[PDB]
Scaffold this motif. Sequence first.
Motif, PDB file in Angstrom:
ATOM      1  N   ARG A  38     -34.339  26.461  43.489  1.00  0.00           N
ATOM      2  CA  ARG A  38     -35.669  26.071  43.941  1.00  0.00           C
ATOM      3  C   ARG A  38     -36.515  27.237  44.420  1.00  0.00           C
ATOM      4  O   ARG A  38     -37.702  27.293  44.094  1.00  0.00           O
ATOM      5  N   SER A  39     -35.937  28.163  45.179  1.00  0.00           N
ATOM      6  CA  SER A  39     -36.673  29.317  45.670  1.00  0.00           C
ATOM      7  C   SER A  39     -35.727  30.503  45.724  1.00  0.00           C
ATOM      8  O   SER A  39     -34.547  30.361  46.057  1.00  0.00           O
ATOM      9  N   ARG A  40     -36.258  31.678  45.396  1.00  0.00           N
ATOM     10  CA  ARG A  40     -35.446  32.882  45.310  1.00  0.00           C
ATOM     11  C   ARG A  40     -36.287  34.075  45.736  1.00  0.00           C
ATOM     12  O   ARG A  40     -37.373  34.295  45.191  1.00  0.00           O
ATOM     13  N   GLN A  41     -35.790  34.830  46.710  1.00  0.00           N
ATOM     14  CA  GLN A  41     -36.446  36.039  47.190  1.00  0.00           C
ATOM     15  C   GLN A  41     -35.515  37.219  46.962  1.00  0.00           C
ATOM     16  O   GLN A  41     -34.395  37.241  47.486  1.00  0.00           O
ATOM     17  N   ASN A  63     -35.618  41.215  47.301  1.00  0.00           N
ATOM     18  CA  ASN A  63     -36.225  42.472  47.725  1.00  0.00           C
ATOM     19  C   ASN A  63     -35.312  43.619  47.313  1.00  0.00           C
ATOM     20  O   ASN A  63     -34.151  43.676  47.728  1.00  0.00           O
TER      21      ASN A  63
END
Lengths: 50, 123
Positions: free
Chosen positions: A39-42, A44
């Motif tokens: 659903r969501s992926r960050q 960095n």
Amino acid sequence: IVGNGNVHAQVTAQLDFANKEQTEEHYSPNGDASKATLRSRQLNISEQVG
Amino acid sequence: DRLDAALRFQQEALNLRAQRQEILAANIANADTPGYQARDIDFASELKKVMVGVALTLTSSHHIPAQAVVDLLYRVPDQPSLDGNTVDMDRERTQFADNSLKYQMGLTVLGSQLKGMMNVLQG
């Protein structure tokens, strides 16, 4: 085939008179990135080469 | 929030003044390092850049929220030293005093705005 009266059989039955209730939960494994639903992926990423 | 929009400019100016203060003090501290270049930031351009993001979506309780994580310009040397150090005492001392004064002014303005917003509510 054997004939009337030329055969005798008796049956005994071990029965189940115990009330049982069961709820089962199953999760599909998602450890492999190919079958993993997101659903969501960050992500960095930093690379400071000197 | 509308409260952030009112106080965004002064907060960003105060943070930029603190960062430039740290940079100037680093220039002062490394005055004797041979080969050290004196670095600084252009306050107005960086203030434009900060004044002018996407929290990842959390479907349930276990889902972990998104985890959060300026450009330095070289000072033009005035006198050529032999060890390659371009830090000038007088210029950066004046800049340091000026940045301290402007940090105090920003604190004063932000405090006045907050105090006005408070006396509007008190009653």
